[PDB]
Amino acid sequence: MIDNLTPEERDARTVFCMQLAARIRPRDLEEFFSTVGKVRDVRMISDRNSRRSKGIAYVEFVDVSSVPLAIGLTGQRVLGVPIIVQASQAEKNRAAA
RNA sequence: GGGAUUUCCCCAAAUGUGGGAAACUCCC
Numbered sequence: 485m486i487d488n489l490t491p492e493e494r495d496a497r498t499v500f501c502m503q504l505a506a507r508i509r510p511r512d513l514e515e516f517f518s519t520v521g522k523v524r525d526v527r528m529i530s531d532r533n534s535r536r537s538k539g540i541a542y543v544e545f546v547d548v549s550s551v552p553l554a555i556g557l558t559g560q561r562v563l564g565v566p567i568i569v570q571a572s573q574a575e576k577n578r579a580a581a
Numbered sequence: 582g583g584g585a586u587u588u589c590c591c592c593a594a595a596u597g598u599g600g601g602a603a604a605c606u607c608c609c
Binding site: 541 | 593
């Protein structure tokens, strides 16, 4: 657990993930992120606005110490499809990868 | 004949939920 969080890193506890399947469970990302720490919850979505077509979700970790590892393994596969991880806010700074 | 898994397309074209369509494997 972080000893000195701020309302700026508080939002980083939530990462945005994309290229997810159209029906993958929120549960299937938690057992996957179990390799980068421990996760609090997941939020699947069905809005497209892009070629991923309902293929996105959000993931919230119980601690920030899981955040930098969750973004580092990015590009792994789950339930038959590749998945990406970006912090919701640093999504644009992480797009340089 | 029924049930389970993923995929693709349109408005805009990568975010907290529009709609439609396609394929494989598995179970009864």
